[PDB]
Amino acid sequence: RNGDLLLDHSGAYVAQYYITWNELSYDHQGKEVLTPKAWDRNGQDLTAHFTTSIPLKGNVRNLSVKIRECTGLAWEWWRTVYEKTDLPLVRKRTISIWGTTLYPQVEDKVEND
């Protein structure tokens, strides 16, 4: 079950993503293994306008998407703008964020029709 995770950041604030998942695999004895995987830009400070597409394989399990907005300097405050765990692996999911620092907004769009 191929899938794509599209992210769009148009908000007037610094955002951070934390996207992790497991890949299902079988060893030379053929029993189950879940391999932790993560987006390479996890924890990176991102500012508008930013877009990306993350390809997700059919053996992907335990998809977790965490989106935070940040503030402060040397040390940062954060509050969660979006957070879902064990997201259904669908054909195409688009998560878009926008708005202001004090009023961040988010849309999660699923397409698996």
Numbering used by the authors: 359 to 471
What does the paper say about this structure?
The cholesterol-dependent cytolysin (CDC), pneumolysin is a virulence factor of the human pathogen Streptococcus pneumoniae (pneumococcus)2, the leading cause of bacterial pneumonia and a major agent of meningitis and septicaemia as well as debilitating diseases such as otitis media, septic arthritis, keratitis and sinusitis. A central feature of the toxin is the formation of transmembrane pores in cholesterol-containing membranes, which lyse or disrupt cell functioning, depending on the concentration. Pneumolysin and other CDCs bind to mammalian membranes through a tryptophan-rich loop and a threonine-leucine pair within a membrane-binding domain at the base of the toxin. Once bound to the membrane, monomers then oligomerise to form a pre-pore complex that subsequently undergoes a complex set of structural transitions to form a transmembrane pore, typically comprising 30–50 subunits.
Full-length pneumolysin and a truncated form comprising the membrane-binding domain (domain 4) were produced by expression in E. coli and purified by affinity and gel filtration chromatography. Crystal of the membrane-binding domain were grown at room temperature and contained two molecules in the asymmetric unit. By contrast, the loop is partially folded back in the structure of domain 4 alone, and fully bent back against the body of domain 4 in the previously determined structure of perfringolysin O12. Together the structures are consistent with previous suggestion that the loop springs outwards and downwards when the toxin binds to the membrane of a mammalian cell. In the crystal structure, Glu434 not only forms a salt bridge with Arg399 but also interacts with Arg437 that in turn forms part of the binding interface by packing against the adjacent monomer. Interestingly, these interactions are only possible when the tryptophan-rich loop is flipped outwards in the putative membrane-binding conformation. When the loop is folded back, as in the domain 4 structure or in the structure of perfringolysin O, Glu434 no longer contacts Arg399 or Arg437. In solution, Glu434 does not contact Arg437, so is unable to contribute towards monomer-monomer packing.
